[PDB]
Paper text:
A deazaflavin-dependent nitroreductase (Ddn) from Mycobacterium tuberculosis catalyzes the reduction of nitroimidazoles such as PA-824, resulting in intracellular release of lethal reactive nitrogen species. The N-terminal 30 residues of Ddn are functionally important but are flexible or access multiple conformations, preventing structural characterization of the full-length, enzymatically active enzyme. The split barrel-like fold is characterized by a central six-stranded antiparallel β barrel in a Greek key topology with four α helices: A at the N terminus (the putative helix removed for Ddn structure determination), B after an extended loop between strands β3 and β4, and C and D between strands β5 and β6. The identification of these residues and the lack of classic catalytic residues in the active site suggest that Ddn functions primarily by precisely orienting PA-824 for efficient direct hydride transfer from F420 and potentially through additional transition-state stabilization.
Well-dispersed signals for 113 of 114 nonproline residues were observed by 1H-15N-HSQC NMR spectroscopy for uniformly 15N-labeled NΔ30 Ddn protein, suggesting a well-defined three-dimensional structure. This sample also showed significant chemical shift perturbation upon addition of oxidized or reduced coenzyme F420, demonstrating tight binding of the coenzyme and suggesting that this construct adopts a physiologically relevant form. As expected (Manjunatha et al., 2006a; Taylor et al., 2010), the backbone trace shows high similarity to proteins in the split barrel-like family of flavin-binding proteins. The initial structure was then used to solve the structure of the longer NΔ30 construct by molecular replacement based on a 1.55 Å data set (Apo-1 in Table 1) and of a 1.85 Å resolution NΔ33 crystal (P3221 space group; Apo-2 in Table 1). All but the first five amino-terminal residues could be built into the electron density for both crystal forms (36–151 and 39–151, respectively). The asymmetric units (ASUs) for the Apo-1 and Apo-2 crystals both contain single molecules with similar structures (root-mean-square deviation [rmsd] is 0.96 Å). This alignment omits 14 of 113 shared Cα atoms because of conformational differences in the same regions that differ upon coenzyme binding. In Apo-1 and Apo-2, α helix D is highly disrupted, with repositioning of residues 129–144 relative to the holo-enzyme structures complementing movement of the post-β3 loop. In Apo-1, the side chain of Y136 is flipped away from the F420 binding site, with the oxygen atom moving 19 Å relative to the Holo-1 structure.
Author numbering: 36 to 151
Write the structure that this text describes.
Amino acid sequence: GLGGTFQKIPVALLTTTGRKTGQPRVNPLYFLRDGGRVIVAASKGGAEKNPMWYLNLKANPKVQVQIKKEVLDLTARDATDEERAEYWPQLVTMYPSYQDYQSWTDRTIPIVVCEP
């Protein structure tokens, strides 16, 4: 039950710009890569809705993603509903800690597409 992670769980470091500060903030997140896109997500919503990184990128879509030692400059947007339903099962399959197949239906769980 290692899913798709083998012996190393993949995590991306997302840098967003503070919506009040205009200074960078970094957050480790699970992700998928889909061609040139990087999809990032949180696994919890409800009390954890609207984390700072998400609010930052809603205000300013320019982000950086570091995966291993690769650094990408990307632009972020919400996954559309179709994309939520398409990518969430892939995240469930990849990561053993993502277990609820239907959590994509809860809009308080952010799912963000970062593209070039």
